[PDB]
Design an enzyme around this catalytic site. Sequence first.
Site, PDB file in Angstrom:
ATOM      1  N   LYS B  57       0.840  -1.252   0.000  1.00  0.00           N
ATOM      2  CA  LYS B  57       0.000   0.000   0.000  1.00  0.00           C
ATOM      3  C   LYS B  57       0.856   1.277   0.000  1.00  0.00           C
ATOM      4  CE  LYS B  57      -3.288   2.589   2.730  1.00  0.00           C
ATOM      5  NZ  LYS B  57      -3.360   4.077   2.973  1.00  0.00           N
ATOM      6  N   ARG B 106      -9.249   8.173  23.489  1.00  0.00           N
ATOM      7  CA  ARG B 106      -7.931   8.456  22.971  1.00  0.00           C
ATOM      8  C   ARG B 106      -6.872   7.924  23.918  1.00  0.00           C
ATOM      9  NH1 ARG B 106     -10.406  12.945  22.016  1.00  0.00           N
ATOM     10  NH2 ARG B 106     -10.875  13.520  19.854  1.00  0.00           N
ATOM     11  N   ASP B 166      -9.260  20.946  17.813  1.00  0.00           N
ATOM     12  CA  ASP B 166     -10.386  21.249  18.675  1.00  0.00           C
ATOM     13  C   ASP B 166     -10.813  22.641  18.472  1.00  0.00           C
ATOM     14  OD1 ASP B 166     -10.674  18.903  20.911  1.00  0.00           O
ATOM     15  OD2 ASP B 166      -8.637  19.115  20.237  1.00  0.00           O
ATOM     16  N   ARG B 169     -12.561  23.554  15.124  1.00  0.00           N
ATOM     17  CA  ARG B 169     -13.958  23.131  15.262  1.00  0.00           C
ATOM     18  C   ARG B 169     -14.754  24.118  16.090  1.00  0.00           C
ATOM     19  NH1 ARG B 169     -12.234  16.916  16.828  1.00  0.00           N
ATOM     20  NH2 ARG B 169     -11.941  16.251  14.692  1.00  0.00           N
ATOM     21  N   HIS B 193      -6.115  17.333  24.074  1.00  0.00           N
ATOM     22  CA  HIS B 193      -6.866  17.002  22.849  1.00  0.00           C
ATOM     23  C   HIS B 193      -7.720  15.812  23.200  1.00  0.00           C
ATOM     24  CE1 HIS B 193      -8.009  16.306  18.742  1.00  0.00           C
ATOM     25  NE2 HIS B 193      -7.482  15.100  18.752  1.00  0.00           N
TER      26      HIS B 193
HETATM   27  N1  LIG Z   1      -4.264  14.248  16.694  1.00  0.00           N
HETATM   28  C1  LIG Z   1      -5.365  14.153  15.956  1.00  0.00           C
HETATM   29  O1  LIG Z   1      -6.237  15.252  15.786  1.00  0.00           O
HETATM   30  C2  LIG Z   1      -5.695  12.834  15.325  1.00  0.00           C
HETATM   31  C3  LIG Z   1      -6.830  12.765  14.549  1.00  0.00           C
HETATM   32  C4  LIG Z   1      -7.219  11.587  13.934  1.00  0.00           C
HETATM   33  C5  LIG Z   1      -6.459  10.470  14.107  1.00  0.00           C
HETATM   34  N2  LIG Z   1      -5.333  10.535  14.857  1.00  0.00           N
HETATM   35  C6  LIG Z   1      -4.522   9.324  14.981  1.00  0.00           C
HETATM   36  O2  LIG Z   1      -4.148   8.717  13.770  1.00  0.00           O
HETATM   37  C7  LIG Z   1      -3.551   7.508  14.124  1.00  0.00           C
HETATM   38  C8  LIG Z   1      -3.809   6.634  12.936  1.00  0.00           C
HETATM   39  O3  LIG Z   1      -5.081   7.016  12.437  1.00  0.00           O
HETATM   40  P1  LIG Z   1      -5.592   6.456  11.015  1.00  0.00           P
HETATM   41  O4  LIG Z   1      -7.065   6.583  10.873  1.00  0.00           O
HETATM   42  O5  LIG Z   1      -4.537   6.864  10.048  1.00  0.00           O
HETATM   43  O6  LIG Z   1      -5.375   4.892  11.218  1.00  0.00           O
HETATM   44  P2  LIG Z   1      -4.908   3.947  10.021  1.00  0.00           P
HETATM   45  O7  LIG Z   1      -5.241   2.591  10.479  1.00  0.00           O
HETATM   46  O8  LIG Z   1      -5.613   4.449   8.749  1.00  0.00           O
HETATM   47  O9  LIG Z   1      -3.350   4.184   9.823  1.00  0.00           O
HETATM   48  C9  LIG Z   1      -2.439   3.398  10.514  1.00  0.00           C
HETATM   49  C10 LIG Z   1      -1.191   3.234   9.700  1.00  0.00           C
HETATM   50  O10 LIG Z   1      -0.067   3.134  10.571  1.00  0.00           O
HETATM   51  C11 LIG Z   1       0.832   2.147  10.061  1.00  0.00           C
HETATM   52  N3  LIG Z   1       1.763   1.655  11.109  1.00  0.00           N
HETATM   53  C12 LIG Z   1       1.439   0.901  12.203  1.00  0.00           C
HETATM   54  N4  LIG Z   1       2.549   0.627  12.959  1.00  0.00           N
HETATM   55  C13 LIG Z   1       3.576   1.251  12.360  1.00  0.00           C
HETATM   56  C14 LIG Z   1       4.908   1.337  12.746  1.00  0.00           C
HETATM   57  N5  LIG Z   1       5.288   0.708  13.852  1.00  0.00           N
HETATM   58  N6  LIG Z   1       5.802   2.050  11.957  1.00  0.00           N
HETATM   59  C15 LIG Z   1       5.319   2.664  10.800  1.00  0.00           C
HETATM   60  N7  LIG Z   1       3.967   2.589  10.435  1.00  0.00           N
HETATM   61  C16 LIG Z   1       3.105   1.890  11.205  1.00  0.00           C
HETATM   62  C17 LIG Z   1      -0.122   1.134   9.430  1.00  0.00           C
HETATM   63  O11 LIG Z   1       0.439   0.576   8.278  1.00  0.00           O
HETATM   64  C18 LIG Z   1      -1.277   1.945   8.936  1.00  0.00           C
HETATM   65  O12 LIG Z   1      -1.025   2.215   7.601  1.00  0.00           O
HETATM   66  C19 LIG Z   1      -4.239   7.159  15.425  1.00  0.00           C
HETATM   67  O13 LIG Z   1      -3.354   7.283  16.502  1.00  0.00           O
HETATM   68  C20 LIG Z   1      -5.260   8.224  15.663  1.00  0.00           C
HETATM   69  O14 LIG Z   1      -5.407   8.639  16.995  1.00  0.00           O
HETATM   70  C21 LIG Z   1      -4.930  11.685  15.476  1.00  0.00           C
HETATM   71  O1  LIG Z   2      -9.910  14.826  16.832  1.00  0.00           O
HETATM   72  C1  LIG Z   2      -9.809  14.037  15.897  1.00  0.00           C
HETATM   73  O2  LIG Z   2     -10.025  14.402  14.743  1.00  0.00           O
HETATM   74  C2  LIG Z   2      -9.402  12.616  16.123  1.00  0.00           C
HETATM   75  N1  LIG Z   2     -10.031  11.594  15.596  1.00  0.00           N
HETATM   76  O3  LIG Z   2      -9.327  10.425  15.999  1.00  0.00           O
HETATM   77  N2  LIG Z   2      -8.252  10.863  16.766  1.00  0.00           N
HETATM   78  C3  LIG Z   2      -8.304  12.186  16.838  1.00  0.00           C
HETATM   79  O4  LIG Z   2      -7.504  12.910  17.431  1.00  0.00           O
END
Ligand SMILES: NC(=O)c1ccc[n+]([C@@H]2O[C@H](COP(=O)([O-])OP(=O)(O)OC[C@H]3O[C@@H](n4cnc5c(N)ncnc54)[C@H](O)[C@@H]3O)[C@@H](O)[C@H]2O)c1
Ligand SMILES: O=C(O)c1nonc1O
Lengths: 332, 332, 332, 332
Positions: B57, B106, B166, B169, B193
Site C-alpha cells: 500500500k 484516545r 479542537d 472546530r 486534545h
Molecule cells: N491528533 C489528531 O487530531 C488525530 C486525529 C485523527 C487520528 N489521529 C490518529 O491517527 C492515528 C492513525 O489514524 P488512522 O485513521 O490513520 O489509522 P490507520 O489505520 O488508517 O493508519 C495506521 C497506519 O499506521 C501504520 N503503522 C502501524 N505501525 C507502524 C509502525 N510501527 N511504523 C510505521 N507505520 C506503522 C499502518 O500501516 C497503517 O497504515 C491514530 O493514533 C489516531 O489517533 C490523530
Molecule cells: O480529533 C480528531 O479528529 C481525532 N479523531 O481520531 N483521533 C483524533 O484525534
Amino acid sequence: ATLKEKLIAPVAEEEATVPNNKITVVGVGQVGMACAISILGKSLADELALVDVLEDKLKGEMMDLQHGSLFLQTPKIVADKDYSVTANSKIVVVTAGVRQQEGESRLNLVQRNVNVFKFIIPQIVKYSPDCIIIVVSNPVDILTYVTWKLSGLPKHRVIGSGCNLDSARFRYLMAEKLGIHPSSCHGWILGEHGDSSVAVWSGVNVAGVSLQELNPEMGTDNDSENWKEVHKMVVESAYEVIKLKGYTNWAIGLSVADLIESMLKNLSRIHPVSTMVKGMYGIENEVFLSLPCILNARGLTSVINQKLKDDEVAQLKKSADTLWDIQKDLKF
Amino acid sequence: ATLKEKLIAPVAEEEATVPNNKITVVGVGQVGMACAISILGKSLADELALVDVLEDKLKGEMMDLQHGSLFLQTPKIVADKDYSVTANSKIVVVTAGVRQQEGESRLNLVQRNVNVFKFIIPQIVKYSPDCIIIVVSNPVDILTYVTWKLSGLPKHRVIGSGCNLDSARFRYLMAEKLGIHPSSCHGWILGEHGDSSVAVWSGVNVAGVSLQELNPEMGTDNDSENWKEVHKMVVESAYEVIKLKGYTNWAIGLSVADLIESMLKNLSRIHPVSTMVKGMYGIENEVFLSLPCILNARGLTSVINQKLKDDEVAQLKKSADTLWDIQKDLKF
Amino acid sequence: ATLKEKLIAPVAEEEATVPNNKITVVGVGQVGMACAISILGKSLADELALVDVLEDKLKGEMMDLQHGSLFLQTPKIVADKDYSVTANSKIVVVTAGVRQQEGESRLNLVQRNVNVFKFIIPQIVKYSPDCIIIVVSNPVDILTYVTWKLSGLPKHRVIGSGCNLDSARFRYLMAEKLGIHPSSCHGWILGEHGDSSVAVWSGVNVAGVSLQELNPEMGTDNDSENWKEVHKMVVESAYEVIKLKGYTNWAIGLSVADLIESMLKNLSRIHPVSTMVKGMYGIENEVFLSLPCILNARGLTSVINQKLKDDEVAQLKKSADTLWDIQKDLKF
Amino acid sequence: ATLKEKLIAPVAEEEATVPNNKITVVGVGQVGMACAISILGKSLADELALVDVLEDKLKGEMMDLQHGSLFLQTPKIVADKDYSVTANSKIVVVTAGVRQQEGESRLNLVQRNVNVFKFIIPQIVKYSPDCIIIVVSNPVDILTYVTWKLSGLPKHRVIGSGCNLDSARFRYLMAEKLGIHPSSCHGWILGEHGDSSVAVWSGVNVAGVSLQELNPEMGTDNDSENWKEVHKMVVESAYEVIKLKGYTNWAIGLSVADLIESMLKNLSRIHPVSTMVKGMYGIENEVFLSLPCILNARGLTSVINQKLKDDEVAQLKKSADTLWDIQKDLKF
Ligand SMILES: NC(=O)c1ccc[n+]([C@@H]2O[C@H](COP(=O)([O-])OP(=O)(O)OC[C@H]3O[C@@H](n4cnc5c(N)ncnc54)[C@H](O)[C@@H]3O)[C@@H](O)[C@H]2O)c1
Ligand SMILES: O=C(O)c1nonc1O
Ligand SMILES: NC(=O)c1ccc[n+]([C@@H]2O[C@H](COP(=O)([O-])OP(=O)(O)OC[C@H]3O[C@@H](n4cnc5c(N)ncnc54)[C@H](O)[C@@H]3O)[C@@H](O)[C@H]2O)c1
Ligand SMILES: NC(=O)c1ccc[n+]([C@@H]2O[C@H](COP(=O)([O-])OP(=O)(O)OC[C@H]3O[C@@H](n4cnc5c(N)ncnc54)[C@H](O)[C@@H]3O)[C@@H](O)[C@H]2O)c1
Ligand SMILES: NC(=O)c1ccc[n+]([C@@H]2O[C@H](COP(=O)([O-])OP(=O)(O)OC[C@H]3O[C@@H](n4cnc5c(N)ncnc54)[C@H](O)[C@@H]3O)[C@@H](O)[C@H]2O)c1
Ligand SMILES: O=C(O)c1nonc1O
Ligand SMILES: O=C(O)c1nonc1O
Ligand SMILES: O=C(O)c1nonc1O
C-alpha cells in the site's frame, strides 16, 4: 520588561534564525519594485532585502512593503544602502542603474551600467558568497557576462533575465491569435533579449501540432499568413511600451518571480534564459545569450540542445557576434 | 543512451542535491494521506517521504501521488519501510499506529502506541536529528511526552498537534452561530486534545469585543443560552464522526499542514499546540498539553502566558492531572 | 483558413463570454497599478479593465500587464478612456484624482476629487449597474459618502478602503514589539483614515489576552510601554512615507485586494473598512467612518456592535464631527 | 437577544447570498473525497455539496470537512442524500458507482453503473439544470455518452475525465527519464481512458524540440529508449496501483480539480478530455473519447484539429466500436 517579557515566555532560547530563503532585490526602481511586489506575492522569501543607492527612496519602499506585512508571508523585510543587509541571500535580483530614454537602445547603456555593476556585483559575493544572481539591468546578456566575471561565480549561479520575458510576449501574441491561454501555446525566442532575437518556428506549436509544418510559409517574410510580424511585435515591444508609459516592469517582475519559484522550489522546469554559450552552434567565445535552460535549486544546471534550422543558427551567430564585439573591448 | 544523454547538456556538475524543506509522513493511513495531500497542494515539500510497515500500500500511495506530479510543486516523492528515506527532513509528521474504535478513549491507545513510538522514534532521529517531530497519533499529548523522552530533541522540536484542531472546530461552531468566517471568530480550546479540554471563554472574541463580558453567565453551570454545549460539541466531535465514517482525517490532515506552513515559512504565528507545561498555572509535572505557542522556522519557541479565570486554571489543572496520571506509570 | 479555423474545431459555437468576475480599476497611477498587480497575483479577476484620462499611459499599463499574461490567471485585460470598458464589473475600484503633497492633509484634497468623483461616478453606474464601489481616492471616507449619494448604490455596496490599511500598520507595529506575525496580533484602529484615527485599546489582544488588563494605563500619557507612540506612528505613517518616496501604494494595493478576496470568495470576514455610521455611538448625521464590518459577495452586509470605552467613543465623536463638518457643505 | 443580535448589526437588512460557484461532488468514497479535498484546497468553490446514498458516511465526510473550515475559503459545506442540496450548481463531478476489483478491466462495470447513472444524472439536471457535468465513474466514456443523453445537455456541458490523468501519468513517466518537471515534458495520450489509449508520439516534445524527429524508433517494436514501455506503464498504472492500495484517488482527484480551475477561471487552456468525436477521423458513432480541448467557463467548447496517422486513427476507431457495441443495446 515590557509585554514581550511577561507575555511571551521562551520555550527555546533567544535565538537567531539564519535566513533560509532570503532574496535581495537590488534596485527599487520601477523594475526593482515589480519584482519585489511579485516575489512577496508568491510568498517566496522568508526575508526580503532591498539595496539601492537612494537611501531615502529605499527606507520608504522598505517601509511600504512593511505595512502590508499582514497580507504577506515574509517575516523580515529590510533595506540599506550598505550591502551588509544582503548577507546570506539565496537569490539576488540586480535591477539597478540607468534605463533606456525614449528610443535609446539597450546596448547604449553598457558603458554606464557596467560602471554600476563594477561596484555592486562584487559587494554581493562579499555578503552572499553562495548565491544565485539574477541580472535584469540592461545590456542584460552583456552584463550577465560582466556579472559572471566580477562575481567570480560558477556559470550555473549566474542567470540572465534573458528572453523569458520575450518568450511570454510571444506566447501572448500567439494566444490572442488562437484565443487560448499562453500556458497552452508553446514556442521560443532565444538570443539577445531585444533586437537580435530569434524566433524558433521549428518549435512553435499547440498540443504537439508543429505550425512550421502546418504552414512552412511561417516566418518567411512577404509570404505567410502573418507570422513575420509577431516576432517583430515581440522585438519592437519594449520600445512601444516606453513611448506610452516610460518603462516596463509588470511583465519583467513576474518573469523573475517565475524564475525564482522554479529555483527555490527546485522544480527543474524549462526557461529560455541568458547563459554562456561558448562551444554551441559554432560559437567562437564566452557570449551570454538565452537558451532553454533547466532551473532548479542549484541555479541553471543544464541548457537544452536543439536541432535548429540553418537560418536560426545564422541569426544566433549574428547575435553572439554583436555581443562579443562589445565584450572583447570590455576589459576590467 | 536515453535522450537525456544529449538532449540535456549540463552547466553544473551532475552532483549532489539535498532537499531544503523535506517532509516525512510516518504512516500512510487515512490520517496519513490526508496530511500528505494537504501538504502537497500548499506545496510545502520539495520532497515528500512516506514510511509504513504495509510495504505494498505504501508503494500504492507513493505511485499514486507521483502520478499527480504535473499538478504539484514537489519534485521527489519516495517511500519505504526503512527510515533511510526520511534522511534530512525538516519535519516528520508521525501518524503511525492504532486509532480509535467506535467509542474508544484516545487515552486507551497509550499502551500500544507507546510500544510503536518506542521502536520507531530512534529510527527517525537516526536519519534526521535536526527535525521538528509533529506527533498526531493518539493519545497525542502523552506520545508527544513519550516522543520527547525517547528522541533527545529539545522541547521546541517536539510538537504535538494538540488543540490546533479542537480549536478550529470551536471557531467553526462559533462561526456557524454568528455568520462569519471561522478566521474572523476567535476562541481557544487548550488542554488534553480530547475528553478533558478547556474552553478559555475569557478570550472568546469578535472584532476584539469580549463575549463573556457580553454574556457573563457564559460557559456557566446551566445559565448561559448556548455555550457549554458547544464545548461539549467540540469534545464529542471525533466520536460523533468516527461513528458515521470509521475515522477522522481531513480536518486533522489540514491542521497538520497549518502548523507545517507556519513553521517552514517562518511566520511566527500562534497555535495552541501540545508543549511541556511544567511550572505553568501551578503545574508540578512535565505534562504535555496544548497552549498558545508561537511556531516559527525553529519550531515551538514561545508560549503565551495567559490570564485565565479562577475556574479556567482549575479545569486546566484538571486536564493536567489526568494526563499526568496516565503518564506517571508509562515507565519504559 | 484563419489559423484558428485550421487548428480549432469549435464545439459550443462561437464566443459570447458571460463576464462574471470583472474588476475595474479607475486610475492607473502608482496606487491604481498596485491594486491591479495585487489583484492579478491572487487571480481574483477573470477580466481586468483599467480606466484613466491619460490615454497613452493607460495603454501602456494594459500592454504591460497583457505581456505578463502567461504568468497569470486573468484571461482578459482591457483599458480605455470610456467607461464602456468596465461593463458588468462585479467590483470597481476608484483610485483616481490628486494626492498628498509633502505635508498636505488628506481632507485638503477634497474639493478637487469631489469634482473628479462628480463626473467619474455616474458613468461607472451607467455601465456596471450592479456593482461594488471600493473608493481608495482621498479623503477616503468623505469620498465614499460622496460616492454613496451620487451612485445611489445601496450603502452596503459602497465600501471605503478606510482603516483596513491603518490597523494593518498598527498590527505590524505591535507585531514588532512582540515578535510575532501581525496576523497573530489583534488590534483595531477605527474612524477616519487620517489623524482622528482611534486605536480601540479595549480590543488590542494576542491569543485572547488583553494588552490593557496586562497594562491598564495603555494608550494614556505616561505608561511603561508607551502605547500612544504606536498609534501616533500609525497616523504619521502616510506623511513619513510620502516624504521619502512621493506616495504610498503597495501596502494599500494589498489591502484593497485583501478586501476583494473576502468579497469575491464570499468569506464574510471582518475588516475595519469604512461604512455609513448613522445610528451608531450618538452620530446623528450620514457619516462614513471605519467600523469593524463583515465583507462578502454582497459587499458590506454587517457592522460589529463594539463595547467601546467612554474616552474611545468621544474620539469617534471627534472624528465624526470633523468629517461631518466638511461633508455638509457639498454642492449636490 | 440572540448573541448575533447584541453583536451583529445588519447593514444590508437581510442576509441571503445569491448562489454562485457552488460545486457538487457526487459520491464520497476514495475519489469523491480526494476530488473534494483538492477542490477545497484550491479555493475553487463557495459551496461544496456532497451527495450519496450511504447517508451515514456522507454526514461524516460532510462534518470532517466542515471542521477544517478555518483553513479554507469555502464558506458553506453541505451534504444530503436528496439531490436538493445540489441545487444551483455550476460544476458537478460524478464519481459515484462501483469500481474494478483487482484484475477487473473498466468495461466489467457498465451494467451495475449504468443503473447508477440512470438514477442520478436526471437528479443533477432536476435541481441544477444550468450546469457543466464532469464524469469520472467507470467505465467513463461509456458513461460520459450515457450522461450526454440522460441529462440532455448540450455537447459542451458534458465532459469526461477521460485521458487527462493518463497524459499526466505519461508526462510524469517521461519526467523520470529526463529529470525535469512533467510540466516542461509535453506529450499526449488520447482516446479511451483504459487499455486502448494512444500515444501521439509526434507531439511528444520538450522545449521546442521534437523527440521522434530525433529518435525515430519511438513507438515501434524495438526502440532503444524503450518508449512503447512508457505507454505500457500509463496503461498498466491503474491495475498495478489497484494491486497495492485497492484503488486510485489522488491522481484522479487533483486532475479533476485542474479541470475545475481551468473552467471556473475561464482560462481556456487545453486538456485531453473526453467529448463527442463523430466527424473527427471518420467516426460515424455518437461516442466520446479524449481529445485536446478548450476548457473555459462554458465548459468544453472546442477541439484541436490535429494531423493523426493511420495506426492511431485505427486505434481510435476500434476503440469507438467496442464503445458503440455495448452502447447500441443500452435499454435507455
Ligand atoms: N491528533 C489528531 O487530531 C488525530 C486525529 C485523527 C487520528 N489521529 C490518529 O491517527 C492515528 C492513525 O489514524 P488512522 O485513521 O490513520 O489509522 P490507520 O489505520 O488508517 O493508519 C495506521 C497506519 O499506521 C501504520 N503503522 C502501524 N505501525 C507502524 C509502525 N510501527 N511504523 C510505521 N507505520 C506503522 C499502518 O500501516 C497503517 O497504515 C491514530 O493514533 C489516531 O489517533 C490523530
Ligand atoms: O480529533 C480528531 O479528529 C481525532 N479523531 O481520531 N483521533 C483524533 O484525534
Ligand atoms: N532585462 C530585462 O528584460 C529588462 C526589462 C525592463 C527593464 N530592464 C532594465 O532594468 C533597469 C531598471 O529599470 P527601472 O525602470 O527600475 O529604472 P529606474 O530609473 O525606474 O530605477 C533606477 C534604479 O536603480 C538605481 N540606480 C541608478 N543608478 C544607480 C547606480 N549607479 N548605482 C546603484 N543604483 C542606481 C536607482 O536608485 C533606482 O533604484 C533598467 O536598466 C532597465 O533597462 C531590463
Ligand atoms: N486610502 C488609502 O490608504 C490611500 C493611500 C495612498 C493614496 N491614496 C490616494 O489615492 C489616489 C491616487 O494616488 P496615487 O498615488 O495613485 O496618485 P497618482 O498620481 O499615481 O494617480 C493619479 C491618477 O489619477 C488619474 N486621474 C485624474 N483625473 C482623472 C479622471 N478625471 N478620470 C480618470 N482618472 C483620472 C490620473 O490620470 C492618474 O492616472 C490619491 O487620491 C491618493 O491620495 C489613498
Ligand atoms: N476516470 C478516472 O481517471 C477514475 C479514476 C479512479 C476511479 N474512477 C472510478 O470512480 C469510481 C469509484 O472510485 P472509488 O475508489 O471512490 O470507489 P468508492 O467505493 O470509494 O466510492 C463509491 C461511492 O459511490 C457511491 N455509490 C454506489 N452506488 C451508488 C448509487 N447507486 N448512487 C449514489 N452513489 C452510489 C457509494 O455510496 C460510495 O459513496 C469507480 O467508477 C472508479 O473506476 C475513475
Ligand atoms: O524587456 C523590456 O521590456 C525592457 N524594458 O526596459 N529594458 C528592457 O529590456
Ligand atoms: O495612508 C496612506 O497610505 C495614504 N497616502 O496618501 N493617501 C493615503 O491614504
Ligand atoms: O485511471 C485510473 O487510475 C482508474 N482507476 O480506477 N478507475 C480508473 O479509471
